Design an enzyme around this catalytic site. Structure first.
Site, short mmCIF file in Angstrom:
data_model
loop_
_atom_site.label_atom_id
_atom_site.label_comp_id
_atom_site.label_asym_id
_atom_site.label_seq_id
_atom_site.Cartn_x
_atom_site.Cartn_y
_atom_site.Cartn_z
CB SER A 161 -0.98 -0.11 1.32
OG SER A 161 -0.25 -0.24 2.33
CG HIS B 144 -1.98 3.31 5.28
ND1 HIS B 144 -2.79 3.03 5.92
CD2 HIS B 144 -1.41 2.42 4.63
CE1 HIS B 144 -2.66 1.78 6.15
NE2 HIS B 144 -1.82 1.34 5.47
CG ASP C 127 -4.34 5.02 8.56
OD1 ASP C 127 -3.38 5.67 8.52
OD2 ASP C 127 -4.62 4.43 7.53
CG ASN D 142 1.30 -5.28 4.84
OD1 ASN D 142 0.54 -4.57 5.49
ND2 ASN D 142 1.33 -5.06 3.36
N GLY E 260 -1.88 -4.39 1.24
CA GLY E 260 -1.78 -5.50 1.98
C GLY E 260 -0.96 -6.73 1.88
#
Length: 177
Positions: A10, A156, A153, A72, A43
């Site tokens: 991502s 990101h 969040d 991840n 992801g």
């Protein structure tokens, strides 16, 4: 035109935005010259990336491969040991394809483990030295210093941050390409 293959998650594919809005698409526009192929999937673990690598290499025959994976891992079920090994093969496959591997340093949130972070982070410098390849700085370090460039969040980067990242990457990759 030469091709730069971006194998990432991502941070490169973009989170909650189209790939056209993500920094690799902006970098490609800055470059009627070097071709940037964004083979990143939100992801993706280092293993999921390695699984896609074979076809990507024989399909795009890139001169350089930017590896941005690992972040991840630690959420799906692997340890620094496994992560280190997965990335190790990726570098090998890239070299075996006559392409130059470009590894990006990855770092985890302060709240992810006391000594776990040190072990995870050390993986990149070790592999970079082991294969003697360029080790780019983790670009998110500059982004974190700008709340307005972060998504809710706090992990990101948002749409507004992409241009900055594209320019930052152009500067880092310039000598490498």
């Amino acid at each position: 035109a030469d091709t730069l293959l971006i194998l990432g998650d991502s941070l490169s594919a973009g989170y909650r935005m189209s790939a056209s809005a993500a920094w690799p698409a902006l970098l490609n526009d800055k470059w009627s010259k070097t071709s940037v192929v964004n083979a990143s999937i939100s992801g993706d673990t280092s293993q999921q990336g390695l699984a896609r690598l074979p076809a990507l290499l024989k399909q795009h025959q890139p001169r350089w491969v930017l590896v941005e994976l690992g972040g991840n891992d630690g959420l799906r079920g692997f340890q620094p040991q496994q992560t280190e090994q997965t990335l190790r093969q990726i570098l090998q496959d890239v070299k075996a394809a006559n392409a130059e591997p470009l590894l990006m340093q990855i770092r985890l949130p302060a709240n992810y483990g006391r000594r776990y972070n040190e072990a995870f982070s050390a993986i990149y410098p070790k592999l970079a030295k082991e294969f003697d390849v360029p080790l780019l700085p983790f670009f998110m370090e500059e982004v974190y210093l700008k709340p307005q460039w972060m998504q809710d969040d706090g992990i990101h980067p948002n749409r507004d941050a992409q241009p900055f990242i594209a320019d930052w990457m152009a500067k880092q990759l310039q000598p490498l390409v």
